[PDB]
Amino acid sequence: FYYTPMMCFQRLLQEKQFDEATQWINYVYNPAGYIVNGEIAPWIWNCRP
Amino acid sequence: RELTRDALNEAKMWYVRTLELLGDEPEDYGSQQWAAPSLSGAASQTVQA
Amino acid sequence: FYYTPMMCFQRLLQEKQFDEATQWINYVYNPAGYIVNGEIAPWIWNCRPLEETTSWNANPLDAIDPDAVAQNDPMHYKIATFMRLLDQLILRGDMAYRELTRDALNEAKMWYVRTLELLGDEPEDYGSQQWAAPSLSGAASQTVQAAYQQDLTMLGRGGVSKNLRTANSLVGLFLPEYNPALTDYWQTLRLRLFN
Amino acid sequence: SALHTMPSVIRTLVNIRYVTALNKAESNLPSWDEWQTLAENMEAGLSTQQAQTLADYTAERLSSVLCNWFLANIQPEGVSLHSRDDLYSYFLIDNQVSSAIKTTRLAEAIAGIQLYINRALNRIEPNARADVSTRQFFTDWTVNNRYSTWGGVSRLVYYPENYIDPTQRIGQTRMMDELLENISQSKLSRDTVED
Amino acid sequence: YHETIEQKKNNRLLEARIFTRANPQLSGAIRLGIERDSVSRSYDEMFGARSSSFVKPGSVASMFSPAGYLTELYREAKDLHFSSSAYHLDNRRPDLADLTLSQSNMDTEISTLTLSNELLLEHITRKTGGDSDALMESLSTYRQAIDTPYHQPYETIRQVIMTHDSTLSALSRNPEVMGQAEGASLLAILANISPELYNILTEEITEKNADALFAQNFSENITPENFASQSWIAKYYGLELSEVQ
Amino acid sequence: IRIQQRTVDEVDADIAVLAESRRSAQNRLEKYQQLYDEDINHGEQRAMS
Amino acid sequence: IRIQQRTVDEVDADIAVLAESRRSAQNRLEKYQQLYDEDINHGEQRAMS
Amino acid sequence: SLSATASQYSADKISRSEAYRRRRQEWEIQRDNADGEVKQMDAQLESL
Amino acid sequence: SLSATASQYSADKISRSEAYRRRRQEWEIQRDNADGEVKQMDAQLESL
Amino acid sequence: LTIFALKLNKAIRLCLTSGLSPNELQTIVRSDNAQGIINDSVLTKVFYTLFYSHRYALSFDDAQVLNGSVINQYADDDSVSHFNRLFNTPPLKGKIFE
Amino acid sequence: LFYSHRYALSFDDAQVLNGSVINQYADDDSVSHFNRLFNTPPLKGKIFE
């Protein structure tokens, strides 16, 4: 839930894939929140621990 | 990097967003009134304990 | 019937095999027609789905796929193949131009004249003559947007010839733009002919 | 002559008893319109580049003064505006920049609208309409935050041919892929092509 | 929603198709392989020459131009805040709602400072009710701001004299004019002190007029309780903590 | 006067030398830029995959 | 006059220097052209096939 | 497994083919350098 | 053993990928050299 | 707090509008009078210090002393003062007594 | 044309010089002649001439 998403994020950032990196890091965090079932997610972070 | 006008506008947008998510940084406050102790005062094992 | 012939055509064009590329692309399209059983072929294209305008896609916009869009609308494939042939002709012409020999320049002239012949004549701007300047509210009018959407939907699922006059005074729409690739081709051919 | 100004203007400059409510002879400070006219007369004999330099300097000075006055006088409810960057964020227009930069009205509107969208989406501006913020455009804001990406995704529908890749396709079969590796040699001889 | 999304996708597909048919650039020997549809004729009769009307690249009338991008942005941005809230786009910037969409409005180049100054002037005028010249005359005597007083002709004169001859060497080479002018005018033209600034700096501060002077020099929201914070002073004057220490 | 006219001929011959220096150097520049920005081609990603 | 005759000797020695510069540079030119336009030879296409 | 082996065979085959193409491009660029300096000194010669 | 074989396969694959990256970096550096000498002679031209 | 607040407003406004450093203003006012008030003499000294700095290219303390003020022996004290810069660079053999 | 050939003057400049008046209302997509002469830039107030 935590290490692999940043693994991909770091690889994409190193290889200049900015929008793919942002989309992948949205799985763990998003400053604009998360859209679940078409509604504002009450939680701030998409990682439970 | 490319110094185009639209690129500079996009960089302005990115930097403004970075400032927005960064907020405002604080400054030094303890250096205002931190006293100057002696070496014995600093190494006081009684105070450390 | 479609993807492999251009695979070979693209490889040959990248590797400067001009006549082999032309011969291979003749299997899918030939401006001079096709010779079958020693007679003029009545069809224009040597690909049946392209000639018959057959679509083999239902939801192309469900994902970002130009391939799916072209599957939904088959003649975009025809436009792509035509532009590939034009590019092959242009590479032939400027490869002849490279060596600056007199016969090479004559051959480049022939190639460029043929390219102009198959390209025809380009049109110009006409909507900018009378396009009005609307306000931001007029442009963002959701009522006008919904009216246009309703008109498009009723033209799509039906074929109704009523509502003859659409009251063009509703200035909240834009106009299609010419192909940048085609304009670049025209400018390149013009400058080559000038040189 | 050294100052490139009229002798009576020199006399007026000398006659300025800058005493400002006594401690010396008297306050010979001119009136407001007299000050304006004297400035016009003494400045009328400059060059052109100097004129634009003075115009830019005065523009920057009055911009800073107006920003300070607005901050210290006019504060609409619900906004704790206290700085130049606060005014920037509120009005979606940059107030602390130089005169060297040039832009258009529509480009400034793009900048302001994009900044406002970012402010609303990042949940930093209070009382944001979170119900509205969950539309398709805001979901696709990753490709809607820049004009280039939005233009590309818009043109992908009307002109998919420009984005069609003749060498590869989404969903291409592995057998066609291995055909591609078996056809991507350095130089493609005919017999190798038919093989 | 599935129906709505499918409908919009189908409408976009139909519009792209009809523009493909109506593109005049494809003539073109491939024009022989292009047919006219019944839906194409229906669109033609419905919308006149709309399908046949095209624009060159870079024209403001295109949907791929920044004009269409801005139109869609405003369409999606008109309701990020309620019209009652001060954060509403229309409430904060009413001047944006009536922006003209013309080719010249995006072809003309102008400094962003000019637009910012015009917006600030519009706000100041709509608030106070005065003219620009009256505003300048009031600013040359204003006191409740760190930048004020701002004497525009005085600043112009100082900048012009600095541009022409710094340190007044030319005037110094002519001593006969120094017997008539004293150091007050020289200080005015060299340093940055307007007459109002001089009056502010050379007024005695006593408990008899302490509150009056405080009210003269500061706004109603600027109280000694607010001033008592060092961080408040720093953020008010744009200075640094060690500098005020 | 004839001598210095010949000298002017020398200097503008040199500036023509440097103009075609620009031609050659800029040709090198676009060649190297095309090599760098294209980087790795579809054949090489095919081999890697 | 003898001095400037020696100077003329200097300058035409230099132009002879540049003539044999042309010899060497053009030799390089045809060598590199022959390498480039021949590219890949029948042995290498045999290995590939 | 031996299909994978032939896959590596095709892989280094096409990799060295692309290496050959890179060699060709480098040769073309350095030939441009050669004739560029050729005309460099061509103009230098008339100056001299 | 054949898993080890595929391990060597991935090993030289990533090694030649990094060689490609080194090639890209060298190309970038020498392109910087090219445009650097381009502006070198740009200023030399106005001097001349 | 009102009167000292106004005094600090005066000082910070003049420093911002004239580029004067806080320690430069401090030494100027100390050389003028211990009251710490603002009069015509202080601004005349500032005028002449700036004028000499513009033409003769002199330091703030140098021009301040030249226009009529005394040498500041007690500077900000984190570095060399003016008196020590003039007569203690370096002391010959013994400590200075001047 | 005669003035443009010898004195190297603009069309509007030579037209005014031969006896015509300054065109205040140009094509209006750019600066007119009157504005080019007396509005580059306006001093402080709008021009009234």
Residue numbers in the entry:
A (entry chain A): 1809 to 1857
B (entry chain A): 1906 to 1954
C (entry chain B): 1809 to 2003
D (entry chain B): 881 to 1075
E (entry chain B): 50 to 294
F (entry chain C), G (entry chain D): 2102 to 2150
H (entry chain D), I (entry chain C): 2200 to 2247
J (entry chain B): 441 to 538
Pull text from the paper:
ABC toxin complexes (Tcs) are a class of α-pore forming toxins (αPFTs) that consist of three subunits capable of assembling into a single protein apparatus with the ability to shuttle and translocate toxic peptides into target cells. The two TcAs termed Xn-XptA1 and Xn-XptA2 are the targeting components of each complex and display variations in insect specificity. The TcAs are the largest subunits of the complex and contain a translocation channel with hydrophobic loops at the end allowing for membrane permeation. Upon TcA binding and an environmental pH change, the complex undergoes a conformational change into an active state in which the translocation channel is exposed and pierces the target cell membrane.
To optimize the natural peptide shuttling and translocation mechanism of Xn-XptA2, our first strategy consisted of inserting the pharmacophore sequence of the TATE region of the DOTATATE peptide into the outermost loops of the NDs to alter the targeting potential of Xn-XptA2. We inserted the YWKT amino acids in between Threonine at position 1181 (T1181) and Proline at position 1183 (P1183) with the wt Aspartic Acid at position 1182 (D1182) replaced by the Threonine (T) in the YWKT sequence. The immunoreactive fraction was observed to be 2.8%, indicating no specific binding of Xn-XptA2 YWKT to SSTR2. To test whether the structural integrity of Xn-XptA2 YWKT was intact, we solved the structure to 4.3 Å resolution using cryo-EM single particle analysis (SPA). The biggest deviation in structure lies between G298 and P440. This stretch of 142 amino acids comprises RBD A on the periphery of the outer shell. The structural rearrangement of RBD A in Xn-XptA2 YWKT consists mainly of a significant loss in secondary structure in the form of β-sheets. In contrast, β-sheets in the Xn-XptA2 YWKT RBD A are only observed at positions G328-V335 and I433-P440 with the former regions of β-sheets rearranging into loops. RBD A is ~130 angstroms and 742 residues away from the outer loops of the ND at the YWKT insertion site (P440-T1181), indicating that disruption of these outer loops has an allosteric effect on upstream domains. Comparatively, in the Xn-XptA2 YWKT structure, the narrowest constriction point in the pore has a maximum radius of 4.6 Å and is also compressed by four amino acids from two separate protomers: D518 (Chain A), Q152 (Chain E), Q294 (Chain A), and K291 (Chain A).
